[PDB]
Amino acid sequence: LKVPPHSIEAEQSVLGGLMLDNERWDDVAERVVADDFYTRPHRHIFTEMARLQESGSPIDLITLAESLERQGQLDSVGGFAYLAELSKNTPSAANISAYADIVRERAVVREMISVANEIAEAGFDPQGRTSEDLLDLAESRVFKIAESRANKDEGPKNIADVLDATVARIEQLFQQPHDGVTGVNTGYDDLNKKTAGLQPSDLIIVAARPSMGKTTFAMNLVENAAMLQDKPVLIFSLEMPSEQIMMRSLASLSRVDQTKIRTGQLDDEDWARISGTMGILLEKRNIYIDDSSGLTPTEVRSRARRIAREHGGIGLIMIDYLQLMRVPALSDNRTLEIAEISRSLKALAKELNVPVVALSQLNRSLEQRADKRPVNSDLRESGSIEQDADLIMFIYRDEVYHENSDLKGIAEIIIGKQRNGPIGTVRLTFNGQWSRFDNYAGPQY
Amino acid sequence: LKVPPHSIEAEQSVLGGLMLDNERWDDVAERVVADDFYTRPHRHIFTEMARLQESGSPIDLITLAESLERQGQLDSVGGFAYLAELSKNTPSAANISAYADIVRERAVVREMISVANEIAEAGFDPQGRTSEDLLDLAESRVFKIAESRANKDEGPKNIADVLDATVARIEQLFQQPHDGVTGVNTGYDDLNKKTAGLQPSDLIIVAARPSMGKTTFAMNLVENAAMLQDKPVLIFSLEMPSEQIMMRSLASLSRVDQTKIRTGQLDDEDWARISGTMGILLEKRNIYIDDSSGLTPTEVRSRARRIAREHGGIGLIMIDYLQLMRVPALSDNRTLEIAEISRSLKALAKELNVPVVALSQLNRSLEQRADKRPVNSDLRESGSIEQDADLIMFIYRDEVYHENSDLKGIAEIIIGKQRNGPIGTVRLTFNGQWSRFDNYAGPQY
Amino acid sequence: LNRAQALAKIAEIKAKFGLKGAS
Ligand SMILES: Nc1ncnc2c1ncn2[C@@H]1O[C@H](COP(=O)(O)OP(=O)(O)O)[C@@H](O)[C@H]1O
Ligand SMILES: Nc1ncnc2c1ncn2[C@@H]1O[C@H](COP(=O)(O)OP(=O)(O)O)[C@@H](O)[C@H]1O
Ligand SMILES: [Mg+2]
Ligand SMILES: [Mg+2]
Numbered sequence: 001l002k003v004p005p006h007s008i009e010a011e012q013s014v015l016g017g018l019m020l021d022n023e024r025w026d027d028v029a030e031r032v033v034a035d036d037f038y039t040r041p042h043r044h045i046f047t048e049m050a051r052l053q054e055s056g057s058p059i060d061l062i063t064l065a066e067s068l069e070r071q072g073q074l075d076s077v078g079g080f081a082y083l084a085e086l087s088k089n090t091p092s093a094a095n096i097s098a099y100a101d102i103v104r105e106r107a108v109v110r111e112m113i114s115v116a117n118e119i120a121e122a123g124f125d126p127q128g129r130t131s132e133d134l135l136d137l138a139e140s141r142v143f144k145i146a147e148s149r150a151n152k153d154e155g156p157k158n159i160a161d162v163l164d165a166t167v168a169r170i171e172q173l174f175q176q177p178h179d180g181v182t183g184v185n186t187g188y189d190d191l192n193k194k195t196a197g198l199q200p201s202d203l204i205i206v207a208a209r210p211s212m213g214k215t216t217f218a219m220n221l222v223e224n225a226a227m228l229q230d231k232p233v234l235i236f237s238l239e240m241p242s243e244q245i246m247m248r249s250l251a252s253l254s255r256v257d258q259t260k261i262r263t264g265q266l267d268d269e270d271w272a273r274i275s276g277t278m279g280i281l282l283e284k285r286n287i288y289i290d291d292s293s294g295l296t297p298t299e300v301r302s303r304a305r306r307i308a309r310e311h312g313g314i315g316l317i318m319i320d321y322l323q324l325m326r327v328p329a330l331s332d333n334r335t336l337e338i339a340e341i342s343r344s345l346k347a348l349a350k351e352l353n354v355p356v357v358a359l360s361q362l363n364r365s366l367e368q369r370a371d372k373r374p375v376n377s378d379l380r381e382s383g384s385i386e387q388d389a390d391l392i393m394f395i396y397r398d399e400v401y402h403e404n405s406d407l408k409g410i411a412e413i414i415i416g417k418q419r420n421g422p423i424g425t426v427r428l429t430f431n432g433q434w435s436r437f438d439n440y441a442g443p444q445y
Numbered sequence: 446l447k448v449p450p451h452s453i454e455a456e457q458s459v460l461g462g463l464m465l466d467n468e469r470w471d472d473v474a475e476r477v478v479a480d481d482f483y484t485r486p487h488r489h490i491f492t493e494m495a496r497l498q499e500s501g502s503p504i505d506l507i508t509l510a511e512s513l514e515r516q517g518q519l520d521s522v523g524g525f526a527y528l529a530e531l532s533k534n535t536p537s538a539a540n541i542s543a544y545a546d547i548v549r550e551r552a553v554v555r556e557m558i559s560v561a562n563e564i565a566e567a568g569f570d571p572q573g574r575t576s577e578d579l580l581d582l583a584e585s586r587v588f589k590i591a592e593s594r595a596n597k598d599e600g601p602k603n604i605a606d607v608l609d610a611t612v613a614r615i616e617q618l619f620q621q622p623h624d625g626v627t628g629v630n631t632g633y634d635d636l637n638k639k640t641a642g643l644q645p646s647d648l649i650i651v652a653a654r655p656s657m658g659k660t661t662f663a664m665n666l667v668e669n670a671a672m673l674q675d676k677p678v679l680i681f682s683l684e685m686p687s688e689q690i691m692m693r694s695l696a697s698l699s700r701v702d703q704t705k706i707r708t709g710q711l712d713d714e715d716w717a718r719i720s721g722t723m724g725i726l727l728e729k730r731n732i733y734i735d736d737s738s739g740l741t742p743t744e745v746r747s748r749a750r751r752i753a754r755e756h757g758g759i760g761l762i763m764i765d766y767l768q769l770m771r772v773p774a775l776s777d778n779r780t781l782e783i784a785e786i787s788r789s790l791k792a793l794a795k796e797l798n799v800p801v802v803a804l805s806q807l808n809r810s811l812e813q814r815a816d817k818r819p820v821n822s823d824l825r826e827s828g829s830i831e832q833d834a835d836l837i838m839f840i841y842r843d844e845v846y847h848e849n850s851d852l853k854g855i856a857e858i859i860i861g862k863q864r865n866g867p868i869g870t871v872r873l874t875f876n877g878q879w880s881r882f883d884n885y886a887g888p889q890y
Numbered sequence: 891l892n893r894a895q896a897l898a899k900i901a902e903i904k905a906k907f908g909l910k911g912a913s
Contacts, residue, residue: 002569004569005568005569105575105576108576108579108580109568109571109576109579112564112568112579112580112583113564113565113568113569116561116562116564116565116568117561117565119557119558119561120558120561120562120565123450123554123555123557123558123561124447124448124450124558126450126554130550131550131553131554134553134554134557135553135557135587135590135591138557138561138587138590139587139591139754140754142583142584142587143584143751143754145580146580146751147755155735155737155748156687156733156734156735156736156748157687159691159726159727159730159732159733159734160727160907160909160911161909161911161912162687162688162691162734163691163723163726163909164904164909164911164912165688166688166691166692166695167900167904167912168912169688170706170709171709171896171897171900173708173709174708174709174710174893174896175893177708177709333776333777335776336776336777339776343739370813375809376655377809387683387738387739387769388738419685419686420686420689422707709896711891711896712891713891716891716896716899720903720906723903723907724906724907727907
């Protein structure tokens with residue numbers, strides 16, 4: 001005897017969990033209907049519970065039994081004995097949503113099997129229909145399954161819902177315009193104005209040619225995020241050891257020359273400043289650095305999840321840089337490896353609801369163009385980076401190529417792609433002595 | 446019993462008629478294949494007959510039996526006794542076309558029954574497959590069942606029939622009172638005159654340099670098509686979220702500055718215009734948007750088929766843009782990936798009899814030429830795009846490159862390739878404030 | 891329009907066009 005697919009325990013769990021906790025009802029209601037239950041009593045119970053919840057009454061054991069007894073339908077379900085069995089077996093540790101999804105899944109499987117049986121029985125008995133008619137009937141029957149279903153977060157939505165979402169977003173933006181200090185603070189006024197901070201669930205790429213200051217700018221962003229928040233800030237530094245990063249951070253925060261720290265030539269005031277900075281950092285304790293090399297995306301995701309679980313959330317994730325990450329299964333093709341890395345990083349960013357910043361490098365050909373300001377195509381072999389990133393920033397310094405530049409000490413962050421905002425150039429001041437970027441106080445065009 | 450649908454009489458009659466009248470092979474060869482026969486002996490006989498017929502030999506009884514004997518396959522068929530029985534029992538005065546159609550029909554019905562049984566068996570034992578996987582399998586099976594039958598109607602048609610169809614088309618061109626538009630109305634008078642709208646079953650490419658207004662122009666075309674037609678208009682957008690699409694559409698239709706909408710700084714007249722636009726849009730309700738990322742041609746085709754099933758046809762399909770689409774099986778070579786994408790889009794446009802407008806990019810080197818107006822050779826890495834597209838339109842704004850430009854607010858649509866007409870430049874007015882293109886009202890040389 | 895006036899206009903638009911599922 002071929003048993004068609006069903007699971008009585010999952011149905012019993014759903015009904016019992018609804019009996020014990022009535023505030024979960026909505027979660028069950030969005031995931032299951034009365035027709036997804038295999039036995040007649042379970043369908044009847046869910047229908048009665050839906051009616052009672054609609055009328056505003058509680059759906060606990062005693063109320064449900066009393067309502068069933070009034071309509072005389074208590075015998076059809078199985079009795080107060082069966083109701084008490086449902087009450088007893090189901091624990092209060094119920095994740096009813098998962099069970100509801102399982103019930104939904106069984107229903108889909110059942111409908112697919114039934115439709116296949118109907119089509120085959122139609123095939124054995126044409127009753128005058130032509131082949132085109134039978135094919136159309138089969139296509140219609142199979143296609144009707146996917147009608148609606150869960151095509152709200154997994155497909156095109158209703159136009160009215162999207163319009164209302166746009167209106168709500170406009171309301172939220174216009175009601176309290178704080179000029180970029182609503183999401184994760186970037187530490188720069190102009191960057192906050194143009195980007196509204198670093199948005200959670202967004203993938204951020206920072207790119208530049210070597211020696212432009214990618215690591216410096218990324219560390220400045222990390223420091224600003226750590227100082228202007230309370231959640232942990234995690235760094236994946238595949239380029240530098242943690243000691244050099246910490247030395248740069250001390251130079252930036254204490255505003256001491258980096259070369260002095262590297263060579264040890266510090267005076268008393270510098271030592272006092274460094275001591276104060278270390279004291280502040282040890283008072284805060286919300287920066288985590290991982291300087292391992294050759295990290296796969298799986299390890300990055302695992303460690304990010306572990307940090308979020310241990311410390312109750314993340315505020316920013318920084319990776320430096322993605323040209324050093326490894327995907328051994330795709331080591332032959334660099335483009336596929338970069339695509340996999342970008343996809344996994346985007347998935348992690350969406351899952352943890354945090355901004356993820358990943359650093360990248362540009363090709364040498366940029367130095368041959370008439371205008372050396374970076375562009376998107378200078379991300380050769382990394383089209384997926386452009387495709388998946390929510391924000392893309394390029395670092396450009398004119399003084400690197402021109403000794404007689406009039407823009408000495410001025411760096412440009414060029415927004416090559418912003419998914420939820422404008423694009424343009426933000427000018428900052430570059431203090432290489434302290435390894436720092438600062439707000440540009442000069443005239444703005 | 447669960448009988449396998451077949452009819453031996455039709456097959457025996459066909460074989461006997463072929464033995465008696467060797468001139469009818471073609472009338473049978475265009476209605477049935479060897480694999481369409483139900484029994485192994487009949488398939489074997491038909492295969493041997495095909496071999497003899499295409500080798501230039503007669504297919505009489507003695508030669509066929511002797512030839513089967515020479516390959517040692519005579520006993521499997523049934524013997525010279527069975528071949529002579531086939532020759533004798535079936536009368537010569539027969540209508541073999543109906544029998545060939547019957548043999549053709551049973552094969553399709555039997556394959557439908559087989560696919561239904563396979564679907565049911567897969568449903569009973571999912572083996573780790575989700576509902577989506579089962580639905581994908583069922584759709585794939587039914588598509589393999591149904592698609593490609595249409596090659597019967599495709600082929601060398603009679604000269605008289607094609608001539609009559611041409612005369613009907615020309616006389617319908619004459620009799621129509623429209624203003625030069627036979628396809629979907631583009632919304633612009635000069636472009637309508639030069640192209641007669643967007644023709645169904647044609648591949649249309651929209652190309653421009655970055656930030657030229659490609660998406661804006663495409664959305665303007667979509668809005669005009671929606672306003673001037675009744676069939677649904679479908680959008681695939683791997684570039685922007687649906688909310689930004691709707692905000693741009695509101696700016697375009699209501700003629701309200703996009704900066705104001707983004708910043709929320711609207712006034713009474715703008716609010717009235719937006720209210721009117723929302724009322725019109727909710728009255729029509731014929732635009733569907735899919736802002737999923739990482740689309741593949743199979744996903745696009747499946748969703749388009751689902752939409753056409755739901756609403757009985759499509760009027761226009763728009764994709765923005767094809768440089769973001771993926772073909773996982775050809776990820777190694779990008780040129781092959783683009784060629785496969787273009788071929789699948791052209792096939793879909795031909796199949797659904799709808800215009801498909803796909804947006805595309807050009808190479809950066811174009812910006813290094815003395816004259817930056819695009820040419821066909823500027824589609825490097827995309828030769829198949831130029832080969833397969835029915836219409837290719839480039840967008841050019843002179844103010845993008847020159848601030849001194851006398852053509853501020855003026856855009857040029859350059860027809861790089863036109864399958865059925867002339868090529869040249871059409872001027873339009875660009876209102877970036879409302880994110881809109883309009884008919885050019887200035888003098889025309 | 892200010893904050894309150896814009897909110898009132900949007901509420902009027904929603905009431906005229908229905909779409910009770912937004913809330
Ligand atoms: N002590 C220093 N004084 C001045 N400039 C420095 C000093 N240390 C580093 N820099 C600057 O930092 C830039 C590169 O820093 P970093 O971002 O760490 O590397 P990358 O740009 O390769 O990521 C160099 O261009 C250099 O001019
Ligand atoms: N609010 C606005 N005001 C003026 N111009 C705008 C506005 N929004 C977008 N644009 C113009 O649209 C052009 C590109 O838009 P879009 O078509 O979406 O991208 P693409 O051309 O790459 O498809 C840019 O050159 C920009 O000048
Ligand atoms: Mg560095
Ligand atoms: Mg665009």
